[PDB]
Amino acid sequence: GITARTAPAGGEVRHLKMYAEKLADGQMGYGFEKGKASVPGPLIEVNEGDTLHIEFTNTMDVRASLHVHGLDYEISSDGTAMNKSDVEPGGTRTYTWRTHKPGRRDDGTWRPGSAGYWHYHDHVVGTEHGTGGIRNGLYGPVIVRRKGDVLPDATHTIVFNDMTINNRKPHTGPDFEATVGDRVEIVMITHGEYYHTFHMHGHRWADNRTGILTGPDDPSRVIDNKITGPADSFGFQIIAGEGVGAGAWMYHCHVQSHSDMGMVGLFLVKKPDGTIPGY
């Protein structure tokens, strides 16, 4: 980053409301507002050092919770039945998530920071591991930025949940749109029973923390295909159409029967006039 926007230093205390609700079709979703729950749940993005107090309200008729990966939380914000941190029907509970910068410990070793592509989901609906909650749609992305991380034009969330993308019916996307040159960020999460392989036509990224190479010294494999299993999360940024131009670029699971059965979407990269060649 030299003219691209980059993340500032963190350290703010932030407050926020979340709700779990039952949707009309039988699914379950999180939202920042009652009546506006989505699957996947809304993106939460913070900077290393930020603290997040989430006033969580369960509007459903069964117990539910909020469990996060990667971020610092005390055992009281575990989101599990065992540690008494789930939420009764109609109830409200404040979960606290903290994040930290990396740095030297007293023993001379290097403490990793919280930065990365993470996620949150339910841990008590259906089973004490949230199997029913997760299947129904109680999951969502969390991004933690390091000071200096490159910021994108837009962020899209792709979740392989059992045999669905984002709980959608087979062969219904989702599709995403960009213009040639856009800096597009993808957050890729997997849930459920199955392993998958995420693949994008026409684009590639680094298999490291940020999905991008800092410079010529980073030996990370550059890839366009990645095996994932339940609760894996990673993310990356690509320049839409870079070196390849506009087009209807497929992304899909590359497990042959999964793509055949509907785990396919389109990354629609447009020319400025909005047209897509071959579409």
Cis peptide leading into 141, omega within 30 of 0? no
Does position 157 bind Cl ion by CB under 5 A?
yes
* Binding window for a copy of itself (CB under 8 A); candidates: 16-24, 35-43, 54-62, 221-229: 221-229
Contact 248, 156 (CB under 8 A): no
Alpha carbon distance, N-terminus to C-terminus of the chain: 34
Contact 66, 19 (CB under 8 A): no
Q: Tokens at residue 239, please?
A: 């320049």
Out of 28, 52, 159, 253, name the contact with Cu ion by CB under 5 A. Answer: 253
Does position 173 bind a copy of itself by CB under 8 A?
no
Partner in contact with 259, chosen from Cu ion, Na ion, a copy of itself, none, beta carbon below 5 to 8 Å by kind: a copy of itself
Question: In terms of CB distance, is 31 or 191 closer to a copy of itself?
Answer: 191
**Which residue's entry shows tokens 């991008």?**
212
Question: In terms of CB distance, is 7 or 246 closer to Cu ion?
Answer: 246
Minimum separation from the CB atom of position 82 to a copy of itself (A): 7
Does position 274 bind a copy of itself by CB under 8 A?
no
Could you tell me how many residues of this chain bind Na ion (CB under 5 A)?
1
CA atoms within 13 A on the CB side of 35: 0
Question: In terms of CB distance, is 23 or 231 closer to a copy of itself?
Answer: 231
Does position 210 bind Cl ion by CB under 5 A?
no
- Which x/- pattern over 78-117 shows residues binding a copy of itself (rule: CB under 8 A)? x-x-xxxx------------x-x-x--xxxxxxxxxxxx-
Q: Which of residues 220-239 bind Cu ion (CB under 5 A)?
A: 231
Count Cβ atoms within 10 A of the Cβ of residue 44 and give its class: 0-12 exposed, 13-18 middle, 19 or more buried.
buried
Does position 197 bind a copy of itself by CB under 8 A?
yes
DSSP states along 19-30: EEEE-TTS-EEE
* Binding window for Cu ion (CB under 5 A); candidates: 14-22, 27-35, 192-200, 205-213: 192-200
Contact 253, 226 (CB under 8 A): no
Using CA of residue 148, residue 150, residue 156, residue 159, what is the dihedral sign?
A: negative
Does position 45 bind Na ion by CB under 5 A?
yes
